[PDB]
Design a protein around this ligand. Structure first.
Ligand SMILES: O=C(NCCN1CCOCC1)c1[nH]c2cc(Cl)ccc2c1-c1c(-c2ccccc2)ncn1Cc1ccc(Cl)cc1
Length: 93
């Protein structure tokens, strides 16, 4: 869904997203988009933000992730929409 060159973009997360990433064990200040997505996956999983009944839906309202993304929920199947929400929260190197 996302071009390989775009997945490999080096990015510098803003303070709030960086805190989220470091909370799930991220050890760096710069990442590829691919790596950012991994740790966001890690976060959603550990906090069980996915719906138990509809496991492709993430309810991020009232959580740090919802504050970052600006939505109450989203589907994990919509990759372009996810990238769009993330870009607000980082600076390209
Ligand atoms: O890193 C992630 N997944 C790798 C491990 N997966 C476990 C489930 O089966 C697919 C592989 C991964 N990282 C994510 C980050 C977000 Cl914000 C949203 C979803 C994901 C996933 C993910 C998930 C998922 C679902 C529920 C709870 C947690 C994660 N399913 C498939 N993917 C892949 C993916 C979706 C959208 C985008 Cl753009 C990029 C990648």
């Amino acid at each position: 869904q996302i071009p390989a060159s775009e997945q490999e973009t080096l990015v510098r997360p803003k303070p709030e997203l960086l805190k989220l990433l470091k909370s799930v064990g991220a050890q760096k200040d710069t990442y590829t988009m691919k790596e950012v997505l991994f740790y966001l996956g890690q976060y959603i999983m550990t906090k069980r933000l996915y719906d138990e009944k509809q496991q492709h839906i993430v309810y991020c309202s009232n959580d740090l992730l919802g504050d970052l993304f600006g939505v109450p929920s989203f589907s994990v199947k919509e990759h372009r929409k996810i990238y769009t929400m993330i870009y607000r929260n980082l600076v390209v190197v």
